[PDB]
Tab-separated table of C-alpha atoms and ligand atoms in Angstrom:
chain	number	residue	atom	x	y	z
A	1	UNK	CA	0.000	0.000	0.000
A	2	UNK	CA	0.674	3.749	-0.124
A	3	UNK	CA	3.275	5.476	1.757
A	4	UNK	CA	3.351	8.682	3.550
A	5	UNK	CA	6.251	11.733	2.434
A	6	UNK	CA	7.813	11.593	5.102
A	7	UNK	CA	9.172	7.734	4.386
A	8	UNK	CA	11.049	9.170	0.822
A	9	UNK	CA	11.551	13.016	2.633
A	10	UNK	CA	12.838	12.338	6.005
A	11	UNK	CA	12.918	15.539	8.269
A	12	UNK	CA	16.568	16.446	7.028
A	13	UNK	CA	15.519	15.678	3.448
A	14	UNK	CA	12.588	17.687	2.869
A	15	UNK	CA	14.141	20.637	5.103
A	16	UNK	CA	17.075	20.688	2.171
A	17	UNK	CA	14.639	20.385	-0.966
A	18	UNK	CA	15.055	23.578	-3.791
A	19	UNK	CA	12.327	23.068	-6.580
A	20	UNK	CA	14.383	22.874	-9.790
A	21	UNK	CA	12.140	22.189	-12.758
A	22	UNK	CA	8.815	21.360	-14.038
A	23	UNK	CA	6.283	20.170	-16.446
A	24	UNK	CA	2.654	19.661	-16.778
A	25	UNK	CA	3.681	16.332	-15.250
A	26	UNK	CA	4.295	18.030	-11.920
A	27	UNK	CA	7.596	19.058	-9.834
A	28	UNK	CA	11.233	18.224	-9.480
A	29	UNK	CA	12.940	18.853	-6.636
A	30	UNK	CA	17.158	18.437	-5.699
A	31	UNK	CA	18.085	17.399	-2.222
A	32	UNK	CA	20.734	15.661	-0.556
A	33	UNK	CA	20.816	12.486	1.239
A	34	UNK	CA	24.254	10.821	2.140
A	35	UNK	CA	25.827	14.168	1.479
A	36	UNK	CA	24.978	13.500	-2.483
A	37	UNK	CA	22.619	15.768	-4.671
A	38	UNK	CA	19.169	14.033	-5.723
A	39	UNK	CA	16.310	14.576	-7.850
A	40	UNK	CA	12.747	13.728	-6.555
A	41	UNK	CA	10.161	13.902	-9.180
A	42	UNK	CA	6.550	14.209	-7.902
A	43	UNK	CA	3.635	13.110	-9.924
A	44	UNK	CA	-0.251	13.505	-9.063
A	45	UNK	CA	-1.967	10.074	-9.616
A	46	UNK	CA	-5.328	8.764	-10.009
A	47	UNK	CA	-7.961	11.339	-8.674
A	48	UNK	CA	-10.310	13.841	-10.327
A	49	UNK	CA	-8.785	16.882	-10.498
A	50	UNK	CA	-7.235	18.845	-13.271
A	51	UNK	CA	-3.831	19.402	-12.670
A	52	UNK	CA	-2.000	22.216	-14.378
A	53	UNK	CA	-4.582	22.054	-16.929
A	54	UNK	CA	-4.301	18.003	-17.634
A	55	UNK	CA	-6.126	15.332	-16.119
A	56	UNK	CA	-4.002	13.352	-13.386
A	57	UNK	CA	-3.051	9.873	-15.192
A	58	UNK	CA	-4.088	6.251	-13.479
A	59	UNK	CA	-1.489	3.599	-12.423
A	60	UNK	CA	-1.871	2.033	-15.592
A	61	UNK	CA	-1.120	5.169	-17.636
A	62	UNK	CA	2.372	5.864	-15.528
A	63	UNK	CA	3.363	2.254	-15.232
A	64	UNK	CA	5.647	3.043	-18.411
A	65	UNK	CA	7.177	5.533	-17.830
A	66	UNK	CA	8.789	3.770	-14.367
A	67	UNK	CA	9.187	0.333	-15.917
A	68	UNK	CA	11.345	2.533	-18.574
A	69	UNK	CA	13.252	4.322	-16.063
A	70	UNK	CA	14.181	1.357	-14.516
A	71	UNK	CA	15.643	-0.712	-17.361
A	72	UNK	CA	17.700	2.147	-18.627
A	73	UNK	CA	19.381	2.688	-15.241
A	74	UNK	CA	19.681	-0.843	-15.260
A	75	UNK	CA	21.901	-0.087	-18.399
A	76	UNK	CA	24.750	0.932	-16.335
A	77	UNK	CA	25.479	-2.414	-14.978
A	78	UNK	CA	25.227	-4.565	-18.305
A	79	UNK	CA	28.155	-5.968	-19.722
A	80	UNK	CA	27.355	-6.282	-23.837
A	81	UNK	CA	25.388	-3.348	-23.824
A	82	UNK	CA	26.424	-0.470	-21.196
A	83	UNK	CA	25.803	2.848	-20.940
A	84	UNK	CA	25.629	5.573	-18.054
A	85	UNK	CA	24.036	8.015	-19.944
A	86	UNK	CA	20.259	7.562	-19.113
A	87	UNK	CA	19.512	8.917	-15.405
A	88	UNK	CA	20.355	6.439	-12.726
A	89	UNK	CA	17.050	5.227	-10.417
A	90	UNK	CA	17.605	5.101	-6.899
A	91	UNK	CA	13.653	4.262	-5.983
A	92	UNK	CA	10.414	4.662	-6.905
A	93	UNK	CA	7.311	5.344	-4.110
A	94	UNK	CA	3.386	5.029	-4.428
A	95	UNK	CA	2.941	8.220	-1.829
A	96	UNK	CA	-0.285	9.373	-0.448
A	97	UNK	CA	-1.165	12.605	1.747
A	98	UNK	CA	-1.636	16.301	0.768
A	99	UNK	CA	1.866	18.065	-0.286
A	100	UNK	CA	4.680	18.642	1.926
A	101	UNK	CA	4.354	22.404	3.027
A	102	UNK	CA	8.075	22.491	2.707
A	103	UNK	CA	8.083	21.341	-0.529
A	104	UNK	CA	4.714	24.227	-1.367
A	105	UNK	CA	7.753	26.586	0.129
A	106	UNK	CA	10.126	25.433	-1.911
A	107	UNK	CA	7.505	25.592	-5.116
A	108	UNK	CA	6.936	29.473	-3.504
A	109	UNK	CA	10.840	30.114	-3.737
A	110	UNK	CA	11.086	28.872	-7.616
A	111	UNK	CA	7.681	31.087	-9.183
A	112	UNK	CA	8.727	33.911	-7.051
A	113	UNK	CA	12.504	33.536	-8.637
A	114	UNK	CA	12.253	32.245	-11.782
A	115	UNK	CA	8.236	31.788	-12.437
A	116	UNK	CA	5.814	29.244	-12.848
A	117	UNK	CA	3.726	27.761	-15.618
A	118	UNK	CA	1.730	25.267	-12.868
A	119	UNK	CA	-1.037	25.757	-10.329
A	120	UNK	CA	0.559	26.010	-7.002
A	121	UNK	CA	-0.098	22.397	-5.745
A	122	UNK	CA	-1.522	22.815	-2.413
A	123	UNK	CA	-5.158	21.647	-3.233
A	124	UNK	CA	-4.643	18.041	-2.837
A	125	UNK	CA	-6.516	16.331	-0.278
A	126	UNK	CA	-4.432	13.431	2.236
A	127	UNK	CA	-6.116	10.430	0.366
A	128	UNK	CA	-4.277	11.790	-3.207
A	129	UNK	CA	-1.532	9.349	-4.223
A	130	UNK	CA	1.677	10.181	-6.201
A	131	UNK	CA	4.307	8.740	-7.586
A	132	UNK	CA	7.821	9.928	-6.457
A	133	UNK	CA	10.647	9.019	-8.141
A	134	UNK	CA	14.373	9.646	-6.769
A	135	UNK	CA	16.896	9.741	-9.500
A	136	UNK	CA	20.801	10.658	-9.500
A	137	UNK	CA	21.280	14.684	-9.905
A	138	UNK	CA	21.862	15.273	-13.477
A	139	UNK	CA	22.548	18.193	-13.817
A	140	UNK	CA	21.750	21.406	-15.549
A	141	UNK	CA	19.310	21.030	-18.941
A	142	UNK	CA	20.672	22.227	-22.099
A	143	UNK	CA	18.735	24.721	-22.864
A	144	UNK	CA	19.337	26.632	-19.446
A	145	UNK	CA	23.209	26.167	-20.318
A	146	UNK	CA	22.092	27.626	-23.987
A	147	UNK	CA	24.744	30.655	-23.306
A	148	UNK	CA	26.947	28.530	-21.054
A	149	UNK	CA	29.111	26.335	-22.751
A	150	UNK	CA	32.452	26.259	-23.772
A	151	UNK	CA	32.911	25.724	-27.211
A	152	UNK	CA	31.775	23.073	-30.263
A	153	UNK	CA	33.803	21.214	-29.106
A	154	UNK	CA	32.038	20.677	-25.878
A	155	UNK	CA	28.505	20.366	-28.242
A	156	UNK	CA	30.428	17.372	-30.638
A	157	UNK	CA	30.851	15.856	-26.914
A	158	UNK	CA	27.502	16.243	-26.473
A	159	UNK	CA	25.819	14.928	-29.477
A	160	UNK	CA	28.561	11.373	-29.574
A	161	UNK	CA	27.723	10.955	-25.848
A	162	UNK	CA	23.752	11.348	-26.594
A	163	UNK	CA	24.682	9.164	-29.539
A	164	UNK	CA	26.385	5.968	-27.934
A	165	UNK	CA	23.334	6.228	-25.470
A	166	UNK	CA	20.398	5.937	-28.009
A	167	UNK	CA	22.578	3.109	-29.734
A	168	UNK	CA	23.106	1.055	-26.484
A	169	UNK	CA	19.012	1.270	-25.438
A	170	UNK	CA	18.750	0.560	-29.365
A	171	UNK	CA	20.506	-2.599	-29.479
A	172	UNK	CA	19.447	-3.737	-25.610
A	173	UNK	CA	15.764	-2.815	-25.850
A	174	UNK	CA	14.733	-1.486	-28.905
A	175	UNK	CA	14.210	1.841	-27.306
A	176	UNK	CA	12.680	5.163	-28.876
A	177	UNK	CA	13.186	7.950	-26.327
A	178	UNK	CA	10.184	9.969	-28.613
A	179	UNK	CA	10.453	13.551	-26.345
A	180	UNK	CA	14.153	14.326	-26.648
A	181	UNK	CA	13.671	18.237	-26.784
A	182	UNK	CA	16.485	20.189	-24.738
A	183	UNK	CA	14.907	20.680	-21.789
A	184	UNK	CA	15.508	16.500	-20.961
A	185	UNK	CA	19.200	16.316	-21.721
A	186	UNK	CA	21.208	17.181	-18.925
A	187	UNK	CA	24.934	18.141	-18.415
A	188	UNK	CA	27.104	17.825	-15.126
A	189	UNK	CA	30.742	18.637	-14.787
A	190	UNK	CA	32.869	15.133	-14.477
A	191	UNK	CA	36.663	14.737	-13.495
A	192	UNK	CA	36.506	11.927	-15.731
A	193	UNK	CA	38.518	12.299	-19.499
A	194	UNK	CA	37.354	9.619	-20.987
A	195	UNK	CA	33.429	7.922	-20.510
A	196	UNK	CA	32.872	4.502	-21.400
A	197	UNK	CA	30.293	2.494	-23.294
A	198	UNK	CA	29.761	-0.970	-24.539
A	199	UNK	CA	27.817	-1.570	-27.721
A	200	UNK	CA	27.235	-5.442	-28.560
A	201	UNK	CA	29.874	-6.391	-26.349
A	202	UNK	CA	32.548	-3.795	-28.432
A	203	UNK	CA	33.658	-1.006	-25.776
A	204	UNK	CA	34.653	2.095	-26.584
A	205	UNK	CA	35.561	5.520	-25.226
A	206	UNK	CA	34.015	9.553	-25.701
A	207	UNK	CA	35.969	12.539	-24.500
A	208	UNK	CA	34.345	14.140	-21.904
A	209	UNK	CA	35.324	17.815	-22.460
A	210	UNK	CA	34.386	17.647	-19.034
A	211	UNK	CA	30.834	16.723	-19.351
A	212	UNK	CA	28.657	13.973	-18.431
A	213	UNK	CA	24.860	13.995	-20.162
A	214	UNK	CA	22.315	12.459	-18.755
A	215	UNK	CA	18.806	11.637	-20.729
A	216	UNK	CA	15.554	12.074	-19.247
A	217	UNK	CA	12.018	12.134	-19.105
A	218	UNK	CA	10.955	8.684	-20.320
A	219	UNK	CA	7.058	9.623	-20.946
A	220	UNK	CA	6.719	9.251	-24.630
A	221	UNK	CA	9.526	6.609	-24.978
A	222	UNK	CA	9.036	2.817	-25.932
A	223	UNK	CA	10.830	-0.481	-25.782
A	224	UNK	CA	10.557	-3.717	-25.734
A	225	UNK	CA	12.205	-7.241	-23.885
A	226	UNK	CA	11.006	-10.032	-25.195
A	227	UNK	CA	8.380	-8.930	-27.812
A	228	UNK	CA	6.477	-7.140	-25.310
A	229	UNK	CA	6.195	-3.566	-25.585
A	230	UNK	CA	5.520	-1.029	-23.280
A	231	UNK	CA	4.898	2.888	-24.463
A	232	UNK	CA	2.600	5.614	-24.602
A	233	UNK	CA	0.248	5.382	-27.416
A	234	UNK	CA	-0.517	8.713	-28.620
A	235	UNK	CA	-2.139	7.398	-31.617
A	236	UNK	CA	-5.935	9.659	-30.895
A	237	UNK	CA	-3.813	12.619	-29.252
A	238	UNK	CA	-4.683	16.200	-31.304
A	239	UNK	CA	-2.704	18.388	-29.783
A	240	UNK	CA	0.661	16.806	-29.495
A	241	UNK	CA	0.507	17.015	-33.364
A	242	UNK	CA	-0.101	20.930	-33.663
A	243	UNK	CA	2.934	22.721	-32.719
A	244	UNK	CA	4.488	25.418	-33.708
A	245	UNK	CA	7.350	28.119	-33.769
A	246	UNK	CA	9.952	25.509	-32.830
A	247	UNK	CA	11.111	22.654	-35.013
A	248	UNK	CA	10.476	20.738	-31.337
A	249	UNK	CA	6.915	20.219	-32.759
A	250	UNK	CA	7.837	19.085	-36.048
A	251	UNK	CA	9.549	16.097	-34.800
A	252	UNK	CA	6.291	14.528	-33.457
A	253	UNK	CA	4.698	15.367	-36.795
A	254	UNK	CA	7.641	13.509	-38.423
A	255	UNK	CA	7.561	10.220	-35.873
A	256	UNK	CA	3.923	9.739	-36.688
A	257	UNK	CA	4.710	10.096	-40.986
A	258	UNK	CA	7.899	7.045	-39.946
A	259	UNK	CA	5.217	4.942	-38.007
A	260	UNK	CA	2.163	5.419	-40.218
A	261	UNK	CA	0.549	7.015	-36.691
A	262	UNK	CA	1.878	3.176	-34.915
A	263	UNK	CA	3.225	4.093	-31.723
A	264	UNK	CA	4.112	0.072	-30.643
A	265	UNK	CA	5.768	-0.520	-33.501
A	266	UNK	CA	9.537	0.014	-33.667
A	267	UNK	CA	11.134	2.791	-35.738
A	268	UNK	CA	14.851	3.935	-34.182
A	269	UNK	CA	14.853	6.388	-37.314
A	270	UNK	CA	13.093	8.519	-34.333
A	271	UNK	CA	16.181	8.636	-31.926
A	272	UNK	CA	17.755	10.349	-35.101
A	273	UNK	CA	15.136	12.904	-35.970
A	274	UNK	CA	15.462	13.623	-32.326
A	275	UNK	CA	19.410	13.625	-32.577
A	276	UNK	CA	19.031	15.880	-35.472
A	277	UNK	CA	16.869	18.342	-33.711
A	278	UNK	CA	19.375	18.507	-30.687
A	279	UNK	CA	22.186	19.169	-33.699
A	280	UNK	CA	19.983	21.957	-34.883
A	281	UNK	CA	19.841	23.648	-31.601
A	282	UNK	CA	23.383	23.279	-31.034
A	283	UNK	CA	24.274	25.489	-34.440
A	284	UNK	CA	21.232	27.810	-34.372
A	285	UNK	CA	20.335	28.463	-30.683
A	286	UNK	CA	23.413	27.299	-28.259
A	287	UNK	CA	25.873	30.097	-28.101
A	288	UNK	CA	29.266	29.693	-27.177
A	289	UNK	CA	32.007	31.642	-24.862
A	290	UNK	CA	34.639	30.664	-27.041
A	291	UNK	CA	34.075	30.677	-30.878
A	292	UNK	CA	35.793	28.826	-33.684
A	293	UNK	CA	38.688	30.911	-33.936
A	294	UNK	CA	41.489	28.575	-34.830
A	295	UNK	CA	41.425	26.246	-37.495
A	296	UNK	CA	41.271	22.945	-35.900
A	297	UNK	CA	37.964	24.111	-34.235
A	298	UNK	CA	36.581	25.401	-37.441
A	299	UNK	CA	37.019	21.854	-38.741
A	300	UNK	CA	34.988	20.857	-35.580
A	301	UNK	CA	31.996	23.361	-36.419
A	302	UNK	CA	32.642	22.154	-40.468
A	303	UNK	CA	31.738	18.351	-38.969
A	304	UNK	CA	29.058	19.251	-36.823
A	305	UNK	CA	27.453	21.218	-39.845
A	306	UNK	CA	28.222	18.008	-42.108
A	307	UNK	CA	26.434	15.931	-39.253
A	308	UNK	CA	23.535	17.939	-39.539
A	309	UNK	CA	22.890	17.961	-43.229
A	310	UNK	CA	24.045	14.167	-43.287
A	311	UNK	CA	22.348	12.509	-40.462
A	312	UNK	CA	18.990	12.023	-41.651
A	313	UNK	CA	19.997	9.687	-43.997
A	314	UNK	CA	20.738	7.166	-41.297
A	315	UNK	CA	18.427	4.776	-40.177
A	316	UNK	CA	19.323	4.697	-36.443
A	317	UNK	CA	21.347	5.761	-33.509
A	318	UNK	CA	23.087	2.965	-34.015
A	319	UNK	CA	24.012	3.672	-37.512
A	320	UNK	CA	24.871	6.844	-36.520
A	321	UNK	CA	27.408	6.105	-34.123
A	322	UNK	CA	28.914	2.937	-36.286
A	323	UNK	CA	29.244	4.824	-39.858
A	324	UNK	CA	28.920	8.688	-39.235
A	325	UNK	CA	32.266	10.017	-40.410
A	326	UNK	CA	31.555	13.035	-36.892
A	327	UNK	CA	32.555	9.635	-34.707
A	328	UNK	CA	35.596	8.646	-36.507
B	1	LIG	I1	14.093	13.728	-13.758
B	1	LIG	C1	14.954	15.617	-13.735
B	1	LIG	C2	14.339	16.740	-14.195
B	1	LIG	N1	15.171	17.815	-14.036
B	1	LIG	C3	14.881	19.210	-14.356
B	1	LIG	O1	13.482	19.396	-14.376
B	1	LIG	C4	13.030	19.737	-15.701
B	1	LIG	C5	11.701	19.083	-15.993
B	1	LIG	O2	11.784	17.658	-16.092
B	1	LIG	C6	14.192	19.333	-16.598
B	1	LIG	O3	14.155	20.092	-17.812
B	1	LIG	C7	15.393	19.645	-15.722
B	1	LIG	O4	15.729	21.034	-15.651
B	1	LIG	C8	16.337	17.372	-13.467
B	1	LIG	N2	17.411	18.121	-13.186
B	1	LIG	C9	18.420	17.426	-12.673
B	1	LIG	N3	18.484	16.115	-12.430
B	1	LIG	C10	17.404	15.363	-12.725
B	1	LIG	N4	17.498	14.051	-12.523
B	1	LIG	C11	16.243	15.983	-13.255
């Protein structure tokens, strides 16, 4: 059954949550347990109300999106196919009880600082359940660091580590992310040089340029293990269809001409529509404190450019990261 907040926020816990981003989907929170940063994610489940204009989904309707979290965190500890770059999942609670006042001043702090598209959630009753999931900090999103980044060279990082990722939940679970706009890749500084991945048991490395990405936001995405697929079928949605003003919105117009409007079917020519979007951004909208001022960097920009006007005529992530001449 159910349990109460304080079981996943603690005292000490919910006394050091900051609200850090959100969606129609609800609130995410950072806070620190065992003096490490993590993200709580808190969804509204199963009752009547309208929340931030949307009706709250059922169990059934966010099973998905947690069975997909967990199998690509699980992704880090394969050995054929490995990758670190989906977010890691440290639990996931069925919660019930009216919000944590701390966390309605934390949600205070954020639309008084940097605004709020969402009703202020403190009109649920104590029988309302949630779902709260605690993943691994990931970050800052890319389009928050749109002015903050080094160089191309940091983006080319960027795009190869996003790359390897797709390929690896490709090849291990037939996975379409399907809602890989820049607010759900995330960048953290890393020590680390080199990352690692293994594709079909063949390891390989990505400079860092001292950046580890993180995918996330699993709500669209599909898989499959063992012919049985779970995703969201948006087959009878309108709206998600009639964008505009951002090539974001063409990409789900351009998944549903791949599929024929057949969400359970598999088509990993969406991971690159989605990888060619995030290339767009990175040459029209990112802006860099260093430019391309030397020549070995304007080769860089030259590749990325190539990659952009090249990549849609690959037929996956995987093919992508195998043949593209940007990964050589
Ligand atoms: I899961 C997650 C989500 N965010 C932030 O909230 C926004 C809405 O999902 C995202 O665009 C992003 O800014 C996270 N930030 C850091 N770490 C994790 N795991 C996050």
């Amino acid at each position: 059954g159910p349990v109460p907040f304080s079981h996943c926020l603690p005292t000490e816990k919910l006394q050091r949550c900051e609200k850090i981003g959100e969606g129609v989907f609800g609130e995410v929170f950072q806070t620190i347990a065992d003096h490490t940063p993590v993200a709580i994610k808190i969804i509204a489940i199963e009752g009547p109300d309208l929340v931030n204009g949307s009706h709250q989904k059922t169990f059934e309707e966010i099973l998905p999106e947690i069975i997909i979290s967990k199998e690509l965190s699980l992704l880090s500890g394969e050995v054929c196919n490995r990758t670190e770059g989906f977010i890691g999942l440290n639990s996931v609670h069925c919660v019930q009880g009216s919000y944590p006042p701390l966390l309605l001043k934390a949600w205070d702090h954020y639309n008084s600082t940097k605004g709020s598209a969402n009703d202020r959630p403190d009109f649920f009753k104590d029988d309302q359940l949630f779902i709260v999931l605690e993943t691994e900090f990931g970050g800052i999103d890319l389009e928050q660091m749109r002015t903050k980044l080094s160089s191309l060279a940091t983006a080319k990082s960027i795009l190869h580590q996003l790359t390897a990722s797709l390929a690896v939940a490709e090849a291990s679970l037939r996975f379409e992310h399907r809602d890989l706009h820049w607010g759900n890749v995330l960048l953290k500084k890393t020590s680390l040089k080199k990352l690692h991945y293994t594709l079909n048991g063949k390891s390989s490395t990505i400079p860092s340029c001292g950046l580890q990405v993180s995918i996330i936001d699993y709500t669209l995405s599909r898989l499959e293990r063992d012919g049985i697929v779970v995703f969201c079928d948006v087959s009878m949605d309108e709206d998600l269809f009639t964008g505009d003003g951002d090539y974001q919105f063409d990409i789900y117009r351009l998944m549903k001409k791949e599929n024929n409007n057949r969400w359970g079917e598999y088509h990993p020519y969406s991971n690159v529509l989605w990888l060619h979007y995030l290339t767009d951004k990175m040459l029209k909208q990112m802006t860099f404190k260093t430019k391309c001022n030397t020549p070995a960097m304007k080769q860089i920009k030259r590749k990325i450019q190539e990659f952009h006007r090249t990549m849609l005529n690959f037929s996956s992530a995987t093919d992508l990261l195998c043949q593209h001449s940007l990964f050589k």
